[PDB]
Design a protein around this ligand. Sequence first.
Ligand SMILES: CC(=O)SCCNC(=O)CCNC(=O)[C@@H](O)C(C)(C)COP(=O)(O)OP(=O)(O)OC[C@@H]1O[C@@H](n2cnc3c(N)ncnc32)[C@H](O)[C@@H]1OP(=O)(O)O
Lengths: 133, 133
Amino acid sequence: MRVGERFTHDFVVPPHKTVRHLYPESPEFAEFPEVFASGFMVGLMEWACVRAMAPYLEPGEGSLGTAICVTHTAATPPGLTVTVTAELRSVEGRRLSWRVSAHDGVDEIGSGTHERAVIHLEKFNAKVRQKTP
Amino acid sequence: MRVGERFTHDFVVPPHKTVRHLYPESPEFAEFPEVFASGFMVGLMEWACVRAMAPYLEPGEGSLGTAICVTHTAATPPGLTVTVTAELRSVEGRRLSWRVSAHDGVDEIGSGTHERAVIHLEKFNAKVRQKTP
Ligand SMILES: CC(=O)SCCNC(=O)CCNC(=O)[C@@H](O)C(C)(C)COP(=O)(O)OP(=O)(O)OC[C@@H]1O[C@@H](n2cnc3c(N)ncnc32)[C@H](O)[C@@H]1OP(=O)(O)O
């Protein structure tokens, strides 16, 4: 990949990406504005950086999110399309970090940075099986 | 709220809180390890700061997350119990800033800062309604 490479990714927000759908088990979230949850916005931004990454993964490799630092500056109702935009700002071994921005057609809805770690799925799957109680 | 308010919030990670359940739409996420997604973690960290400001909100008040900045430094299969510790670190007007950090009983899984904005719910819900195409 090349520091400075950009990428872009679109998502029509359905009504089930609101706060209370992120955690159906939260009494508190049950009464939030029916707006796009910060958790999902995270997931989407990761999703974009995952997409950009894919053609460059070798067999048996994968990646994990290792840092997410974004603001969330407008709320996005269902029906809007969120456009995530993802520029590569660094590679340092297996560690890649991006800029992400998102908007919904109407407003700038947040931006910041995301870091991922390229992993070897077998080794990581085994550590995970090890702490599975 | 005064600075120093610490909550401590506890969650048994079920199998529907892994990467592929954050975005059932994503084929890329579909073949990820079954571990606790960064977005679901974000939503837990948030959930804790919310629980914690519930005593201090007037009737008709609510809140939204306005910034999230965390690491995700170890990984969590379903069946473990994640313990967020939200701590309140700045209060200025409608804006509260909280440290979150999260532990699954084996590893510290992620930490950093989260910002929320206190809002008026009926008023904010009309605005959302207006913006919803
Ligand atoms: C953590 C979660 O799951 S929820 C996160 C999902 N949504 C968000 O985080 C929202 C992102 N942030 C916001 O919407 C915030 O910027 C707040 C929290 C809306 C801050 O915006 P503010 O302009 O300070 O006003 P606030 O929403 O508190 O008050 C209600 C109204 O929104 C204001 N508003 C201004 N711009 C916008 C906008 N782009 N989107 C929504 N509301 C807006 C209105 O002027 C009105 O303000 P008033 O109370 O002074 O009349």
